[PDB]
Design a protein around this ligand. Structure first.
Ligand SMILES: *[C@@H]1O[C@H](CO)[C@@H](O)[C@H](O)[C@H]1NC(C)=O
Ligand SMILES: *[C@@H]1O[C@H](CO)[C@@H](O)[C@H](O)[C@H]1NC(C)=O
Ligand SMILES: *P(=O)(OC(C)C)OC(C)C
Ligand SMILES: *P(=O)(OC(C)C)OC(C)C
Lengths: 29, 250, 279, 279, 250, 29
């Protein structure tokens, strides 16, 4: 649980998602 | 997943597949929340109306999968179940309230690039992120309409306000559940469907970059129908129960 | 009926002619018979054609009838279950052209010594095949190719020394394989392919642990939780998993999955030979 | 020191740089400074990082400094008090990752129009929060979840029309709540929960007395002795209690606690919705 | 065909002759598998080592023939080629692996007593019949030794076990090919030879009385030499490719 | 393809081959 929700193929290598960007943009709308 | 797309490799390393041993078939989706515990929907294991009652020996969990049907050797991991814990107050008789269940694995699983646990919401994340308008993510190998994807699907859906959820169905909505999906007027589609039940509804935290599981795919009238929304089990509100069975049986 | 007991279980009309010292099929049975029990009788020979007058016949039990010859003419368009277990058959009846809808076939505890080429031809709907308790030493290539939907296969308690490399090809739905207590010396490379097999019984065999057993050793380690030990009187799913049961020389002190294989060359892999060709 | 007056009050070393027409942090201040007063200066902008050289800094006053921008980098490991009141800040500084030990935060009389999501994240030790005299119209959900130990909260004299139903969740120690003179039309059901609140200021609001105000009416009757009226220049505890101050339409002739509510359906209760689930 | 005999009239109605237009000559054998598609060996059309690369306009196919040189009028049928499809992974550089090619006819052909299509193996027929010891049939107008028959020749040869094939040559044998022929000790001869390449290796099914093409005459060191066997292109294993180009270009 | 591998001058008239008999006899040996 100490390393929860941190994807090894994404977060862990500064790489983004095809669509994660869409989730963050809703935090402002 | 209706109106979704092909998940990328490893973008949902917590996704789990509840698989029936004999005859071989996909029962439901689920999620990895620890190296020995899996979370899923109660109606996926127990449902008297349909004479449904799967026990430990009828199932196996498949972690780290991408393909829906292949035996992804050296990538996916198969685990057996040691014990199934269904919420004592699961209401299958009226509205699938507290539609949640915990599954402890016979042996811990090793994490990899395809296998990694999701986060459970905390007071801060829950109060801060579970608000109408904000959107999460639903994944699964369920049907593409109310036929089957060859690979894991993904769709982002916005959370809907209690009222709109309430007046979208004749069933008694509870606080132990929220609804998500676009409105007829928003001009966008997407929803879970037969086979995604039990899967997770996650949200990426803008504060610490971590993914949290806010809900469990529970139910819905049809799949992606206008004026209709999907309902998910409110994981945070049931966290007090989750923690209880894990401290006492883990 | 005068000789057999006729019952109505749900929508089924179950005619029971068990233990009545019958030497032939009783005349004038319910025209609407769907389930027929002729178990425990003295019908040294039987001809399926005699059942054609019963066009709704869905299940037939001819077990424990001293059968030494089963005549196969005509056709039973909807027979789905056939039990020929516990008889004296020395050769496998060719049922393909007479029972197109067969889904469950039991010919356990008979006297089979080999299976013919094309043996299961035409049994496209077969889902379960039990051949336990016979005297099979080998199996012909292509045995299961005509039964793509097989989910359960039992070759347990025979005298098998080897299995064909492609025995399981096309069986995308197989979930239970029983090979315990035979005379199996080894498993051919790629035998299991890339298919998920929930239940496998391989104990009770004289496994010859040498460099040829390495593929099997790899398979056993990777699928340890799918290996079980047979126990009469309990569901397969309730049986206990134990990869340690598959032992070298049948000695519980040397489980195949722990076989070192000292000196053996490189296992690495060349590629599980497929059916067709991909580049 | 050459510019500021350095004093020793008990074990504290109080450096006073008040009213010295300063436009920046004076260089070379006592290395052992624990209390720093920079009030009444012209520091249109300030960067907390510039105080890191003073590792014992426990209290910082930056009030009345024409502040329009507060830079938040680095960390002040033991700063417990920060006064940013009476400035020109238009957005709330995110202090969580720079001031881990903050227990008292004052940003009253500035120009805030809203508070950001996660605004108080990381301020786990916060016990007092003053936001009086700003222009807040609404508050984000989850504002106080990261400050569980809050004992005093002041949102008085803003332009609030509504409050989030769960604003107070987790505040088991809150003893003083100031909401007077806003534009509050109503209180959401269950707003106060089952928490004992010794001091509450709710006068000066356009309370809309209709069936939605009944929960608030019940609360006012049950906690009449906990409702006070603000009076400058005297301790809260010395102030006078008066539930009658919470009036409908801001007219002292119709106190909310006396609001009849004729025609209104059944109040009874369905249950104060909790945070988690109990059966 | 070495050690064969005169084929009877119509006993191999699927036999095809790949004929060069100018100068007139027999290039290879081939087979009819449909009214518009012909199957043959890749090295019969393309082979860089010998600067060999025949295109549609260099050839014509002759179906329903018996005589090797006569223009059997009103019996044989001449067809032109619309398109030649050579296996993309045909290995002429190392071991003639995937030595196969498809030829689509400009116009369909009418079947008669001398013109009729052969069957392609199916899962059942392939697994069941392609076993050592069992024997098939090879036909063609190739040389009688390593000179030419005046009429179509025929010889029945037994399939040989992988090992014996493997240790009979220094070339890298693949699974996309099998070998046939008698052993030195079996006291019988027979093999294909210069000119039979591309021709079919057929087997008559004991189950349904139909003839199936298991292989294509591919290669071999010499013709009918002791301790040597002929190699044929495994048609079944390449059936996935065959079906692909016929569904998309037919 | 529906009438594949059935020779009009042989199978289709119950007539056998000079040597087909040899192929079938190998299915037993
Ligand atoms: C489900 O089945 C198990 C045994 O298989 C039994 O003990 C349990 O009580 C059953 N539950 C229901 C709701 O039928
Ligand atoms: C064969 O010749 C054709 C034209 O006649 C040419 O387009 C093709 O690329 C050639 N292939 C080889 C391997 O030389
Ligand atoms: P899920 O597969 O379906 C959801 C779309 C509600 O549930 C099954 C097990 C009934
Ligand atoms: P085929 O005529 O010869 C076989 C006997 C290999 O191949 C020619 C075209 C080289």
């Amino acid at each position: 649980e100490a390393d929860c929700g941190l994807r090894p193929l994404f977060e862990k290598k500064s790489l983004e998602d095809k669509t994660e960007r869409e989730l963050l943009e809703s935090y402002i709308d | 997943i209706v109106e979704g797309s092909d998940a990328e490799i490893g973008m949902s390393p917590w996704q789990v597949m509840l698989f029936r041993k004999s005859p071989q078939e996909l029962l439901c989706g689920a999620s990895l929340i620890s190296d020995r515990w899996v979370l899923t929907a109660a109606h996926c294991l127990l449902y008297p109306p349909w004479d449904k009652n799967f026990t430990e020996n009828d199932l196996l969990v498949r972690i780290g999968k991408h393909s829906r049907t292949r035996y992804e050797r050296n990538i996916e991991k198969i685990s057996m179940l040691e014990k199934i814990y269904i919420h004592p107050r699961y209401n299958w008789r009226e509205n699938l309230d507290r539609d949640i269940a915990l599954m402890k694995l016979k042996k811990p699983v090793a994490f990899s690039d395809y296998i990694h646990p999701v986060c459970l919401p905390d007071r801060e994340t829950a109060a801060s992120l579970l608000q109408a308008g904000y959107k999460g993510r639903v994944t699964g190998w369920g049907n593409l309409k109310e036929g089957q994807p060859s690979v894991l699907q993904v769709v982002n859906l916005p959370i809907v306000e209690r009222p709109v959820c309430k007046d979208s169905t004749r069933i008694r909505i509870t606080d132990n559940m929220f609804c998500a999906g676009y409105k007829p007027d928003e001009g966008k589609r997407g929803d879970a469907c037969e086979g995604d039940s039990g899967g997770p509804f996650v949200m990426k935290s803008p504060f610490n970059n971590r993914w949290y599981q806010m809900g469990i795919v529970s139910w819905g009238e049809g799949c992606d129908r206008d004026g209709k929304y999907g309902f998910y089990t409110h994981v945070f509100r049931l966290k007090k129960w989750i923690q209880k069975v894990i401290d006492q049986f883990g | 009926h005068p000789i057999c007991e006729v019952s109505k279980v749900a929508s089924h009309l179950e005619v029971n002619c068990d233990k009545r010292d019958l030497t032939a099929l009783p005349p004038d049975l319910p025209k609407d018979t769907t389930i027929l029990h002729l178990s425990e009788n003295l019908l040294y020979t039987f001809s399926l054609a005699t059942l054609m007058p019963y066009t709704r016949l869905t299940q037939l039990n001819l077990d424990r009838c001293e059968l030494t010859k089963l005549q196969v003419d005509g056709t039973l368009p909807v027979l789905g279950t056939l039990d020929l277990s516990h008889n004296q058959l020395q050769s496998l009846p060719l049922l393909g052209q007479t029972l197109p809808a067969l889904t469950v076939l039991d010919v356990s505890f008979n006297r089979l010594t080999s299976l013919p080429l094309g043996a299961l031809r035409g049994l496209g709907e077969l889902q379960e095949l039990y051949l336990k308790g016979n005297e099979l030493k080998t199996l012909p290539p292509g045995l299961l190719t005509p039964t793509p939907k097989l989910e359960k296969l039992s070759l347990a308690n025979n005298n098998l020394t080897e299995l064909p490399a492609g025995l399981l090809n096309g069986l995308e739905n197989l979930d239970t394989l029983l090979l315990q207590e035979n005379s199996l010396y080894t498993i051919p490379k790629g035998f299991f392919g890339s298919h998920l097999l929930p239940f496998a019984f391989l104990h009770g065999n004289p496994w010859l642990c040498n460099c040829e057993i390495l593929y099997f050793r790899r398979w056993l380690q990777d699928n340890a939780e799918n290996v079980y030990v047979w126990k009469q009187g309990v569901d397969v799913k309730a049986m206990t998993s134990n990869v340690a049961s598959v032992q070298c020389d049948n000695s519980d002190k040397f489980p195949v999955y722990k076989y070192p294989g000292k000196g053996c060359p490189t296992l690495g892999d060349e590629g599980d030979t497929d059916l067709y060709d991909y580049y």
